[PDB]
Amino acid sequence: SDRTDWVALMRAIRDHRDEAAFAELFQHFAPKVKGFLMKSGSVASQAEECAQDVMATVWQKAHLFDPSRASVATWIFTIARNRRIDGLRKDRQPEPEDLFWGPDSEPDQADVYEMQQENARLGRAIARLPEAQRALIERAFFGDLTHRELAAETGLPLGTIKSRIRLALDRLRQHM
Amino acid sequence: TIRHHVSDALLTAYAAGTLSEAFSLVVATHLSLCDECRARAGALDAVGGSLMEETAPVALSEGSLASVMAQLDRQIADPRAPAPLADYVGRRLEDVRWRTLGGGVRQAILPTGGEAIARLLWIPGGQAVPDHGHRGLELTLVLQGAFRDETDRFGAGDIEIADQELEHTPVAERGLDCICLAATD
Ligand SMILES: [Zn+2]
Ligand SMILES: [Zn+2]
């Protein structure tokens, strides 16, 4: 691990209430949450406020983070997108039941490693996308209604991440 | 088994957070019941996570980190109604504010933001919901039992997606008593 190994920093938050670990995650992801919510239609002042609240949840709910099912960026995003958008909802977006690993079991490290792999793979993929395709994806996430499907107009390797998640969830259920 | 899933386009809108609360609550309640759609959505999530990581950062004001770290907490129920539905019902699904309506059905309109409506349905034994066209897209999740309608059988956990061009008559199948969560725009 590294100043920049987000999964390990997240476990440092979790296992040791590591605040220097939290400084690393904040300094990287807070300006990125800010920039993101602004592309989502937020004004700078409110996007900063939200970025700050996101990162506060990251510390509070750090237990909920499962790297056999998500990258840090993804989970953080999850928290960012489930905020209240007032015209859409009265509170945070309804999210499903919380399935987390107890204060005991880590997920199988092999799953974690294979989850972060498939994940880096897809990040590598989004990056190399023609810009006119990367704009179809950005629009999905920034300012567009339900008449819009992304796993069906893009050709991104979402297939192994899915099974990775299905297989991860099964292990979770066997354990729990 | 569960054979009737959240559509791709509603997964993509869930992933984005761009869905009215009614449509989110049904979809998220299906995720708590269906590990298939959890994985489907969790991969759509990976896309935004990837988008976020590659977003050009915007600086927060000087002092933002230490301001957040100061307020850190430093080193500090009904198996039919899971997930975010338990929020709207508060233990015991059989106990809400029901409205009988009235050829064998009763309903509770669940409190939500947005402009789409969310309601619990209660279709007993062998009772049929009287035929309803749609003033938009409709979403139906079975929490108990089963019901027959469209082209298919829908059981506990299954999700029906109804269009605007759809006339249908949801008849409850016999045996258990059919309780649903529905969403319209
Ligand atoms: Zn499903
Ligand atoms: Zn209907």
Curated annotation (Swiss-Prot), chain A:
The sigma-70 factor domain-2 mediates sequence-specific interaction with the -10 element in promoter DNA, and plays an important role in melting the double-stranded DNA and the formation of the transcription bubble. The sigma-70 factor domain-2 mediates interaction with the RNA polymerase subunits RpoB and RpoC. Interacts transiently with the RNA polymerase catalytic core formed by RpoA, RpoB, RpoC and RpoZ (2 alpha, 1 beta, 1 beta' and 1 omega subunit) to form the RNA polymerase holoenzyme that can initiate transcription. Forms a 1:1 complex (via sigma-70 factor domain 4) with anti-sigma factor ChrR; this inhibits the interaction of RpoE with the RNA polymerase catalytic core. This is ECF RNA polymerase sigma factor RpoE. InterPro entries: RNA_pol_sigma-70-like (IPR039425), RNA_pol_sigma-70_dom (IPR014284), RNA_pol_sigma70_r2 (IPR007627), RNA_pol_sigma70_r4 (IPR007630), RNA_pol_sigma_r2 (IPR013325), RNA_pol_sigma_r3/r4-like (IPR013324), WH-like_DNA-bd_sf (IPR036388). The gene is rpoE. Induction: Induced under conditions that produce singlet oxygen (shift from anaerobic photosynthetic to aerobic growth in light). Not induced by H(2)O(2), paraquat (stimulates superoxide formation) or diamide (alters the thiol redox state). Autoregulated. Part of the rpoE-chrR operon. It comes from the Bacteria. PANTHER family: RNA POLYMERASE ECF-TYPE SIGMA FACTO, RNA POLYMERASE SIGMA FACTOR SIGZ. GO terms for molecular function: DNA binding; sigma factor activity. Disruption phenotype: For single rpoE mutant increased sensitivity to singlet oxygen when carotenoid levels are low. For double rpoE-chrR deletion mutant no effect on anaerobic photosynthetic growth. In illuminated aerobically growing cells single and double deletion is bacteriostatic. Residues 25-92 are annotated as: Sigma-70 factor domain-2. Sigma factors are initiation factors that promote the attachment of RNA polymerase to specific initiation sites and are then released. Extracytoplasmic function (ECF) sigma factors are held in an inactive form by a cognate anti-sigma factor until released. Sigma-E controls a transcriptional response to singlet oxygen, a by-product of photosynthesis; its continuous activity requires constant exposure to singlet oxygen. The regulon has about 180 genes that protect against or repair damage induced by singlet oxygen, including itself and rpoH2, a heat shock-responsive sigma factor. Belongs to the sigma-70 factor family. ECF subfamily. A motif (Interaction with polymerase core subunit RpoC) lies at residues 49-52. Keywords: DNA-binding, Sigma factor, Transcription, Transcription regulation.
UniProtKB/Swiss-Prot annotation, chain B:
It holds the Pfam family zf-HC2. Changing C180S: No effect on zinc binding. Keywords: Activator, DNA-binding, Metal-binding, Transcription, Transcription regulation, Zinc. Changing H4A: No effect on anti-sigma function. The keyword Repeat does not apply. Changing C37R: In Chr4 mutant; loss of function. The keyword Chloroplast does not apply. Residues 1-76 are annotated as: Sufficient to bind sigma factor and inhibit its activity. Induction: Induced by singlet oxygen. Autoregulated. Part of the rpoE-chrR operon. Residues 77-185 are annotated as: Required for response to singlet oxygen. Binds 2 Zn(2+) ion per subunit. The Zn(2+) bound by the N-terminus is required for anti-sigma function, the function of the Zn(2+) bound by the C-terminus is unknown. SUPFAM superfamilies: RmlC-like cupins (SSF51182). Zn(2+) 2 binds at H132, H134, E138, H168. One of its GO terms (molecular function) is metal ion binding. InterPro entries: Anti-sigma_ChrR, Anti_sigma_zinc_sf, ChrR-like_cupin_dom, RmlC-like_jellyroll, RmlC_Cupin_sf, Znf_put. Zn(2+) 1 binds at H5, H30, C34, C37. Anti-sigma factor that inhibits the activity of the extracytoplasmic function (ECF) sigma-E factor (RpoE), thereby indirectly regulating the transcription of the cycA and rpoE genes. ECF sigma factors are held in an inactive form by a cognate anti-sigma factor. The N-terminal anti-sigma domain (residues 1-85) is necessary and sufficient to bind sigma-E and inhibit its activity. The C-terminal domain (residues 86-194) is required to respond to singlet oxygen. NCBIfam families: anti_sig_ChrR. This is Anti-sigma-E factor ChrR. It comes from Cereibacter sphaeroides (strain ATCC 17023 / DSM 158 / JCM 6121 / CCUG 31486 / LMG 2827 / NBRC 12203 / NCIMB 8253 / ATH 2.4.1.).
